[PDB]
Amino acid sequence: SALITENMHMKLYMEGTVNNHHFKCTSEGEGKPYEGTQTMRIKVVEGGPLPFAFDILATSFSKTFINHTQGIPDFFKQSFPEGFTWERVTTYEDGGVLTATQDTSLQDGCLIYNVKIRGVNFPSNGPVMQKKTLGWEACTEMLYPADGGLEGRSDMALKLVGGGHLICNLKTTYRSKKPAKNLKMPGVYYVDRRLERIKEADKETYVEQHEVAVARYCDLPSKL
């Protein structure tokens, strides 16, 4: 009856290109969906070492593991057993652009992610291609219902060697594989998110990554 249990496991396969460099990854992990925490152990299995900072792939390895507090209707957990998809455009302020499309199915009690990456115009002398990145700041995503699906908007800050940040923006469309007759859509809400790199080995051809993610309505006083 309940398909998303207290502890869930993941398998993931990813394939793409950045600028003109092909590659493939696999990853494997586990998390607690209702606590909104999760870990992925990732391997670059083709085309590594990558000639770009791994950070730009980070947001592409898990929407099921968000703590939907306050009885906010959970669009992603509801979509099972059919599952869902996301597609995203991340636009860097220094030219780089990264689209990704994703499929999330459930199979024998294991979440299965199939990702596809397409990056273009990352400046060759930029911090991404010259590997001067130190992971991401935390962020807030705004989700809102749109066309029987959900949309996400967010700005993210990539730390740089030397103190600075390079900023990017994310437009995400989330689509449920489940008939809209069976889904109870949420209002506008907000996910607070902290995505962190735990460990890495061999020039980022092995990376461990963690996320904590908690959904909430705006908690400030209203006057309307």
In b/e form, how buried is each residue of 93-113, taking b as 16+ CB within 10 angstroms?
A: eeebebbbbbebbbeeeebbb
Contacts for 27-35 with beta carbons within 8 Å, 24 or more apart? 27/61, 31/7, 31/62, 31/65, 31/211, 32/6, 32/7, 32/8, 32/65, 33/4, 33/5, 33/6, 33/8, 33/64, 33/65, 33/66, 33/77, 34/6, 34/67, 35/67
Q: Residue 61 has which token pair?
A: 């390895």
In angstroms, the CA 100 to CA 123 distance is: 19
DSSP 188: S
How many angstroms is the resolution?
A: 2.7
Residues 6+ apart with CB under 8 A from 105: 83, 111, 112, 114
d(CA 121, CA 60): 19
Here the CATH number for the domain that contains residue 90 is 2.40.155.10
Count of residues for the chain? 224
Q: How many domains, in total, are found in the chain?
A: 1
16 CA to centre of own chain: 16
Specify the DSSP class assigned to residue 77.
H
Report the first-to-last Cα separation within the chain, whole angstroms. Answer: 40
Helix/strand/coil for 74: coil
Q: For residue 48, what is the DSSP state?
A: P
Strands 139-145 and 133-136: unpaired
Read off the amino acid at residue 151.
E
The approach used to solve this structure was X-ray
Print the domain residue range for 5.
1-224
